[PDB]
Protein backbone atom coordinates (compact mmCIF):
# COMPACT_ATOMS: atom_id res chain seq x y z
CA UNK A 1 0.00 0.00 0.00
CA UNK A 2 2.56 2.56 1.16
CA UNK A 3 4.93 1.75 -1.71
CA UNK A 4 2.20 2.67 -4.21
CA UNK A 5 1.52 5.89 -2.28
CA UNK A 6 5.15 7.03 -2.29
CA UNK A 7 5.45 6.00 -5.95
CA UNK A 8 2.58 8.27 -6.97
CA UNK A 9 3.87 10.99 -4.62
CA UNK A 10 7.25 11.05 -6.35
CA UNK A 11 5.45 10.92 -9.71
CA UNK A 12 3.43 14.06 -8.98
CA UNK A 13 6.36 16.17 -7.80
CA UNK A 14 8.76 17.44 -10.44
CA UNK A 15 5.90 17.52 -12.97
CA UNK A 16 5.07 20.83 -14.66
CA UNK A 17 1.64 21.21 -16.26
CA UNK A 18 2.86 24.39 -17.98
CA UNK A 19 5.30 22.31 -20.09
CA UNK A 20 4.33 19.53 -22.49
CA UNK A 21 6.03 16.11 -22.66
CA UNK A 22 9.41 16.41 -24.39
CA UNK A 23 9.17 20.18 -24.76
CA UNK A 24 12.55 20.37 -26.50
CA UNK A 25 11.96 17.02 -28.21
CA UNK A 26 9.83 15.80 -31.12
CA UNK A 27 6.06 16.37 -31.13
CA UNK A 28 3.96 14.17 -28.87
CA UNK A 29 1.69 11.81 -30.82
CA UNK A 30 -1.86 11.66 -29.45
CA UNK A 31 -4.07 8.74 -30.40
CA UNK A 32 -7.79 9.44 -30.25
CA UNK A 33 -10.81 7.07 -29.84
CA UNK A 34 -14.56 7.70 -29.69
CA UNK A 35 -17.50 5.59 -28.48
CA UNK A 36 -20.80 7.26 -29.36
CA UNK A 37 -23.52 6.54 -26.79
CA UNK A 38 -26.46 8.49 -28.22
CA UNK A 39 -27.09 11.11 -30.92
CA UNK A 40 -29.87 12.81 -29.00
CA UNK A 41 -31.38 15.04 -31.69
CA UNK A 42 -30.60 16.30 -35.19
CA UNK A 43 -32.09 19.70 -36.04
CA UNK A 44 -32.67 21.10 -39.52
CA UNK A 45 -33.80 24.45 -38.09
CA UNK A 46 -30.53 25.15 -36.26
CA UNK A 47 -28.39 22.97 -38.60
CA UNK A 48 -26.71 21.07 -35.78
CA UNK A 49 -26.81 17.79 -33.90
CA UNK A 50 -26.24 16.86 -30.27
CA UNK A 51 -23.91 13.92 -29.68
CA UNK A 52 -23.06 12.17 -26.41
CA UNK A 53 -19.83 10.21 -26.52
CA UNK A 54 -16.93 8.71 -24.64
CA UNK A 55 -13.95 10.65 -26.01
CA UNK A 56 -10.56 9.13 -25.26
CA UNK A 57 -7.09 10.45 -25.95
CA UNK A 58 -3.93 8.37 -25.46
CA UNK A 59 -0.40 9.74 -25.20
CA UNK A 60 3.04 8.78 -23.92
CA UNK A 61 4.63 10.89 -21.17
CA UNK A 62 8.09 10.00 -19.88
CA UNK A 63 7.65 12.04 -16.68
CA UNK A 64 4.71 9.84 -15.62
CA UNK A 65 6.69 6.58 -15.92
CA UNK A 66 6.77 4.20 -12.96
CA UNK A 67 8.26 0.75 -12.39
CA UNK A 68 7.76 -2.14 -9.99
CA UNK A 69 3.95 -1.84 -10.20
CA UNK A 70 2.60 -4.26 -12.86
CA UNK A 71 -0.99 -3.42 -11.92
CA UNK A 72 -2.49 -0.55 -13.89
CA UNK A 73 -3.43 2.54 -11.88
CA UNK A 74 -6.86 4.13 -12.33
CA UNK A 75 -6.33 7.25 -10.24
CA UNK A 76 -9.10 9.57 -9.12
CA UNK A 77 -10.43 11.82 -11.87
CA UNK A 78 -9.39 14.89 -9.85
CA UNK A 79 -5.77 13.80 -10.43
CA UNK A 80 -6.32 14.87 -14.05
CA UNK A 81 -6.21 18.46 -12.76
CA UNK A 82 -2.51 18.07 -11.92
CA UNK A 83 -1.53 16.32 -15.20
CA UNK A 84 -0.88 17.86 -18.61
CA UNK A 85 -3.39 17.12 -21.37
CA UNK A 86 -3.62 18.19 -25.04
CA UNK A 87 -5.44 21.40 -26.04
CA UNK A 88 -7.94 19.36 -28.12
CA UNK A 89 -11.23 21.04 -29.01
CA UNK A 90 -13.96 20.84 -31.58
CA UNK A 91 -14.05 23.55 -34.25
CA UNK A 92 -17.71 23.16 -35.32
CA UNK A 93 -18.98 23.15 -31.72
CA UNK A 94 -21.75 25.52 -30.63
CA UNK A 95 -22.11 24.28 -27.05
CA UNK A 96 -20.83 21.27 -25.12
CA UNK A 97 -20.55 20.02 -21.56
CA UNK A 98 -19.22 17.17 -19.41
CA UNK A 99 -21.66 15.33 -17.18
CA UNK A 100 -21.15 16.09 -13.50
CA UNK A 101 -23.34 13.53 -11.71
CA UNK A 102 -22.55 11.74 -9.45
CA UNK A 103 -18.93 12.83 -9.82
CA UNK A 104 -17.38 14.58 -12.81
CA UNK A 105 -17.56 12.07 -15.67
CA UNK A 106 -13.84 12.01 -16.37
CA UNK A 107 -11.08 9.44 -16.04
CA UNK A 108 -7.28 9.38 -16.08
CA UNK A 109 -5.29 6.14 -16.26
CA UNK A 110 -1.53 5.63 -16.00
CA UNK A 111 0.38 2.60 -17.26
CA UNK A 112 3.75 1.14 -16.18
CA UNK A 113 5.36 2.25 -19.46
CA UNK A 114 4.41 5.87 -18.69
CA UNK A 115 1.39 6.12 -20.99
CA UNK A 116 -1.71 8.18 -20.19
CA UNK A 117 -5.30 7.40 -21.18
CA UNK A 118 -7.64 10.37 -20.66
CA UNK A 119 -11.37 9.76 -21.12
CA UNK A 120 -14.31 12.16 -20.94
CA UNK A 121 -18.08 11.87 -21.35
CA UNK A 122 -18.88 14.82 -23.62
CA UNK A 123 -22.31 15.95 -24.80
CA UNK A 124 -21.61 18.38 -27.65
CA UNK A 125 -23.94 20.26 -30.00
CA UNK A 126 -21.82 19.98 -33.12
CA UNK A 127 -22.70 21.97 -36.24
CA UNK A 128 -23.20 20.55 -39.72
CA UNK A 129 -24.84 22.24 -42.68
CA UNK A 130 -27.70 20.41 -44.39
CA UNK A 131 -28.36 20.71 -48.11
CA UNK A 132 -32.16 20.69 -47.82
CA UNK A 133 -32.66 21.42 -51.53
CA UNK A 134 -33.89 17.82 -51.94
CA UNK A 135 -35.81 17.53 -48.65
CA UNK A 136 -37.17 14.97 -47.63
CA UNK A 137 -35.28 12.97 -50.28
CA UNK A 138 -31.91 14.15 -48.94
CA UNK A 139 -28.72 12.72 -47.45
CA UNK A 140 -26.66 14.75 -44.99
CA UNK A 141 -22.90 14.91 -44.55
CA UNK A 142 -22.36 15.75 -40.89
CA UNK A 143 -18.93 15.95 -39.29
CA UNK A 144 -17.04 16.32 -36.03
CA UNK A 145 -13.72 18.15 -36.49
CA UNK A 146 -11.15 17.76 -33.69
CA UNK A 147 -8.08 20.06 -33.54
CA UNK A 148 -5.45 21.62 -31.25
CA UNK A 149 -6.01 25.27 -30.42
CA UNK A 150 -2.43 26.52 -30.09
CA UNK A 151 0.01 23.81 -31.09
CA UNK A 152 1.13 23.23 -34.68
CA UNK A 153 2.03 19.87 -36.20
CA UNK A 154 5.64 20.50 -35.14
CA UNK A 155 4.55 20.46 -31.46
CA UNK A 156 1.70 17.90 -31.39
CA UNK A 157 0.28 15.35 -33.83
CA UNK A 158 -3.10 13.66 -33.87
CA UNK A 159 -3.91 10.19 -35.26
CA UNK A 160 -6.75 7.68 -34.95
CA UNK A 161 -5.85 4.90 -32.53
CA UNK A 162 -7.04 1.55 -33.82
CA UNK A 163 -7.38 2.83 -37.39
CA UNK A 164 -10.87 2.20 -38.73
CA UNK A 165 -11.75 0.66 -35.34
CA UNK A 166 -11.19 4.06 -33.68
CA UNK A 167 -14.93 4.85 -33.59
CA UNK A 168 -17.45 2.28 -32.34
CA UNK A 169 -21.04 2.24 -31.12
CA UNK A 170 -22.48 3.55 -34.38
CA UNK A 171 -24.61 0.40 -34.65
CA UNK A 172 -26.08 1.22 -31.22
CA UNK A 173 -27.53 4.47 -32.66
CA UNK A 174 -31.11 4.54 -33.99
CA UNK A 175 -32.11 8.08 -34.92
CA UNK A 176 -35.87 8.72 -35.01
CA UNK A 177 -35.83 10.08 -38.60
CA UNK A 178 -32.35 9.40 -40.01
CA UNK A 179 -30.58 6.12 -40.76
CA UNK A 180 -26.79 6.08 -40.52
CA UNK A 181 -25.36 4.70 -43.77
CA UNK A 182 -21.62 5.15 -43.34
CA UNK A 183 -18.98 6.78 -41.15
CA UNK A 184 -15.49 7.82 -42.25
CA UNK A 185 -12.29 8.87 -40.48
CA UNK A 186 -9.90 11.45 -41.96
CA UNK A 187 -6.57 12.46 -40.40
CA UNK A 188 -4.83 15.37 -42.09
CA UNK A 189 -3.04 18.69 -41.57
CA UNK A 190 -4.48 22.10 -42.42
CA UNK A 191 -1.63 24.21 -43.82
CA UNK A 192 -1.41 27.99 -43.36
CA UNK A 193 1.43 30.40 -44.12
CA UNK A 194 2.74 30.27 -40.55
CA UNK A 195 2.49 26.51 -40.12
CA UNK A 196 0.42 23.35 -40.38
CA UNK A 197 -2.10 22.38 -37.69
CA UNK A 198 -3.22 18.74 -37.22
CA UNK A 199 -6.87 17.84 -37.70
CA UNK A 200 -9.08 14.78 -37.41
CA UNK A 201 -12.57 14.44 -38.88
CA UNK A 202 -15.36 11.98 -38.07
CA UNK A 203 -17.93 12.21 -40.87
CA UNK A 204 -21.29 10.42 -40.75
CA UNK A 205 -23.54 10.15 -43.80
CA UNK A 206 -27.21 10.17 -42.75
CA UNK A 207 -30.07 9.08 -45.00
CA UNK A 208 -33.53 10.43 -44.24
CA UNK A 209 -36.49 8.06 -43.95
CA UNK A 210 -39.50 9.21 -45.95
CA UNK A 211 -42.32 6.77 -45.07
CA UNK A 212 -43.80 9.44 -42.82
CA UNK A 213 -44.03 11.90 -45.71
CA UNK A 214 -45.03 9.25 -48.25
CA UNK A 215 -48.12 8.40 -46.19
CA UNK A 216 -49.17 11.82 -44.82
CA UNK A 217 -47.81 14.27 -47.44
CA UNK A 218 -47.52 12.65 -50.88
CA UNK A 219 -50.41 10.17 -50.86
CA UNK A 220 -53.02 12.74 -49.71
CA UNK A 221 -51.82 15.18 -52.37
CA UNK A 222 -52.04 12.53 -55.10
CA UNK A 223 -55.53 11.45 -54.01
CA UNK A 224 -56.84 15.03 -53.83
CA UNK A 225 -55.38 15.61 -57.29
CA UNK A 226 -57.25 12.53 -58.58
CA UNK A 227 -60.48 13.62 -56.87
CA UNK A 228 -60.05 16.89 -58.74
CA UNK A 229 -59.95 14.92 -62.01
CA UNK A 230 -63.24 13.30 -61.00
CA UNK A 231 -64.81 16.63 -62.05
CA UNK A 232 -64.17 15.90 -65.73
CA UNK A 233 -66.65 12.98 -65.68
CA UNK A 234 -69.45 15.01 -64.05
CA UNK A 235 -72.05 16.32 -66.47
CA UNK A 236 -71.20 19.78 -67.74
CA UNK A 237 -74.49 21.37 -66.64
CA UNK A 238 -73.89 20.42 -62.98
CA UNK A 239 -72.32 23.78 -62.21
CA UNK A 240 -72.88 23.60 -58.45
CA UNK A 241 -71.40 20.12 -58.13
CA UNK A 242 -68.37 20.68 -60.35
CA UNK A 243 -67.53 24.11 -58.92
CA UNK A 244 -67.96 22.81 -55.36
CA UNK A 245 -65.71 19.84 -56.07
CA UNK A 246 -63.01 21.97 -57.69
CA UNK A 247 -62.99 24.76 -55.13
CA UNK A 248 -63.09 22.34 -52.21
CA UNK A 249 -60.16 20.41 -53.68
CA UNK A 250 -58.27 23.70 -53.92
CA UNK A 251 -59.19 24.46 -50.31
CA UNK A 252 -58.07 20.99 -49.22
CA UNK A 253 -54.70 21.44 -50.91
CA UNK A 254 -54.38 24.83 -49.23
CA UNK A 255 -55.18 23.21 -45.88
CA UNK A 256 -52.58 20.48 -46.46
CA UNK A 257 -50.01 23.14 -47.35
CA UNK A 258 -50.73 25.44 -44.41
CA UNK A 259 -50.84 22.70 -41.77
CA UNK A 260 -47.82 20.88 -43.18
CA UNK A 261 -45.43 23.81 -42.67
CA UNK A 262 -46.52 23.89 -39.03
CA UNK A 263 -44.75 20.52 -38.58
CA UNK A 264 -41.72 20.70 -40.90
CA UNK A 265 -38.62 22.62 -39.78
CA UNK A 266 -38.97 26.40 -39.49
CA UNK A 267 -36.63 27.41 -42.31
CA UNK A 268 -37.56 29.77 -45.15
CA UNK A 269 -35.76 27.48 -47.59
CA UNK A 270 -37.16 26.14 -50.85
CA UNK A 271 -37.42 22.34 -50.85
CA UNK A 272 -38.59 19.48 -53.05
CA UNK A 273 -41.80 18.93 -51.08
CA UNK A 274 -42.66 22.58 -51.74
CA UNK A 275 -42.31 21.98 -55.49
CA UNK A 276 -44.49 18.88 -55.32
CA UNK A 277 -47.23 20.65 -53.38
CA UNK A 278 -47.06 23.67 -55.69
CA UNK A 279 -47.40 21.41 -58.71
CA UNK A 280 -50.42 19.65 -57.26
CA UNK A 281 -51.90 23.06 -56.41
CA UNK A 282 -51.42 24.19 -60.01
CA UNK A 283 -53.06 20.99 -61.24
CA UNK A 284 -56.20 21.46 -59.14
CA UNK A 285 -56.29 25.13 -60.16
CA UNK A 286 -56.20 24.13 -63.82
CA UNK A 287 -58.90 21.53 -63.14
CA UNK A 288 -61.25 24.29 -61.96
CA UNK A 289 -60.19 26.62 -64.79
CA UNK A 290 -61.14 23.83 -67.19
CA UNK A 291 -64.74 24.00 -66.00
CA UNK A 292 -64.57 27.79 -66.33
CA UNK A 293 -63.79 27.31 -70.02
CA UNK A 294 -66.42 24.57 -70.39
CA UNK A 295 -69.23 26.56 -68.80
CA UNK A 296 -68.47 29.69 -70.81
CA UNK A 297 -68.03 28.06 -74.21
CA UNK A 298 -71.06 25.73 -74.31
CA UNK A 299 -73.54 26.64 -71.57
CA UNK A 300 -72.62 30.32 -71.32
CA UNK A 301 -72.04 31.54 -74.88
CA UNK A 302 -71.61 13.33 -77.13
CA UNK A 303 -69.25 14.74 -74.51
CA UNK A 304 -67.73 18.08 -75.45
CA UNK A 305 -64.16 18.27 -76.71
CA UNK A 306 -62.66 19.98 -73.67
CA UNK A 307 -63.72 17.30 -71.18
CA UNK A 308 -62.84 14.59 -73.70
CA UNK A 309 -59.26 15.82 -73.99
CA UNK A 310 -58.94 16.76 -70.31
CA UNK A 311 -59.78 13.22 -69.22
CA UNK A 312 -56.59 11.95 -70.89
CA UNK A 313 -54.32 15.00 -70.71
CA UNK A 314 -54.64 15.68 -66.98
CA UNK A 315 -53.80 12.12 -65.83
CA UNK A 316 -51.13 11.84 -68.52
CA UNK A 317 -49.59 15.23 -67.72
CA UNK A 318 -49.64 14.52 -63.98
CA UNK A 319 -47.96 11.17 -64.59
CA UNK A 320 -45.30 12.93 -66.68
CA UNK A 321 -44.81 15.53 -63.94
CA UNK A 322 -44.43 12.78 -61.35
CA UNK A 323 -41.93 11.00 -63.59
CA UNK A 324 -39.82 14.13 -64.07
CA UNK A 325 -39.98 14.99 -60.36
CA UNK A 326 -38.98 11.53 -59.14
CA UNK A 327 -36.27 11.19 -61.81
CA UNK A 328 -34.77 14.62 -61.08
CA UNK A 329 -34.88 14.34 -57.28
CA UNK A 330 -33.90 10.63 -57.12
Amino acid sequence: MSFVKETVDKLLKGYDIRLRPDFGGPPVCVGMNIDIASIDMVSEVNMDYTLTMYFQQYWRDKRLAYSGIPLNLTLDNRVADQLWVPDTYFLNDKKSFVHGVTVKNRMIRLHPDGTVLYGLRITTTAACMMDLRRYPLDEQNCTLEIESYGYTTDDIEFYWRGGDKAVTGVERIELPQFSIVEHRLVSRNVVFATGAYPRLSLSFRLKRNIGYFILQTYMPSILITILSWVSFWINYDASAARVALGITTVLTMTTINTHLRETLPKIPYVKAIDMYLMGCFVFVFLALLEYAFVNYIFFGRDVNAIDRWSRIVFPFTFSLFNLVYWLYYV
Partner: protein, 67 residues
Protein backbone atom coordinates in the same frame (compact mmCIF):
# COMPACT_ATOMS: atom_id res chain seq x y z
CA UNK B 1 15.37 27.77 -18.43
CA UNK B 2 11.73 28.08 -19.49
CA UNK B 3 10.51 27.67 -15.91
CA UNK B 4 12.80 30.33 -14.43
CA UNK B 5 11.91 32.79 -17.20
CA UNK B 6 8.22 31.96 -16.74
CA UNK B 7 8.41 32.75 -13.02
CA UNK B 8 10.72 35.76 -13.44
CA UNK B 9 8.39 37.90 -15.55
CA UNK B 10 5.69 37.85 -12.84
CA UNK B 11 7.86 39.78 -10.35
CA UNK B 12 6.25 43.14 -9.74
CA UNK B 13 3.95 43.91 -12.68
CA UNK B 14 0.83 45.19 -11.01
CA UNK B 15 -1.81 43.95 -13.45
CA UNK B 16 -4.22 46.41 -11.84
CA UNK B 17 -2.83 49.15 -14.12
CA UNK B 18 -2.73 49.24 -17.90
CA UNK B 19 0.55 49.72 -19.79
CA UNK B 20 1.46 53.41 -20.08
CA UNK B 21 -0.96 54.35 -17.31
CA UNK B 22 0.13 58.01 -17.16
CA UNK B 23 1.95 58.42 -20.49
CA UNK B 24 -0.36 57.81 -23.45
CA UNK B 25 -3.34 55.74 -24.64
CA UNK B 26 -2.66 52.03 -25.07
CA UNK B 27 -2.96 51.21 -28.77
CA UNK B 28 -4.56 47.80 -29.45
CA UNK B 29 -4.60 46.26 -32.97
CA UNK B 30 -7.54 44.01 -33.63
CA UNK B 31 -8.13 41.26 -36.21
CA UNK B 32 -11.36 39.35 -36.80
CA UNK B 33 -11.87 36.14 -38.77
CA UNK B 34 -15.53 35.21 -39.29
CA UNK B 35 -15.93 31.44 -39.19
CA UNK B 36 -19.66 31.65 -39.91
CA UNK B 37 -22.54 34.11 -39.60
CA UNK B 38 -25.08 31.80 -38.02
CA UNK B 39 -28.85 31.86 -38.48
CA UNK B 40 -30.57 35.24 -38.31
CA UNK B 41 -33.31 34.83 -35.69
CA UNK B 42 -35.64 37.56 -36.92
CA UNK B 43 -38.22 36.75 -34.23
CA UNK B 44 -35.93 38.03 -31.47
CA UNK B 45 -34.10 40.46 -33.82
CA UNK B 46 -30.70 38.84 -33.38
CA UNK B 47 -28.14 36.75 -35.23
CA UNK B 48 -25.38 34.33 -34.28
CA UNK B 49 -21.77 34.80 -35.38
CA UNK B 50 -18.65 32.73 -34.72
CA UNK B 51 -15.38 34.67 -34.78
CA UNK B 52 -11.68 34.33 -34.10
CA UNK B 53 -10.91 37.62 -32.34
CA UNK B 54 -7.20 38.42 -31.99
CA UNK B 55 -6.05 41.63 -30.25
CA UNK B 56 -2.41 42.71 -29.82
CA UNK B 57 -0.71 45.46 -27.82
CA UNK B 58 2.60 46.46 -26.24
CA UNK B 59 3.58 46.02 -22.59
CA UNK B 60 7.15 47.09 -21.84
CA UNK B 61 6.93 45.48 -18.39
CA UNK B 62 6.87 42.01 -20.01
CA UNK B 63 10.17 42.44 -21.87
CA UNK B 64 12.55 39.52 -21.39
CA UNK B 65 15.75 38.73 -23.30
CA UNK B 66 16.32 35.06 -24.12
CA UNK B 67 16.79 32.70 -27.04
Amino acid sequence: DVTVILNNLLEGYDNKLRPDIGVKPTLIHTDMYVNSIGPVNAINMEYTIDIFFAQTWYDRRLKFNST
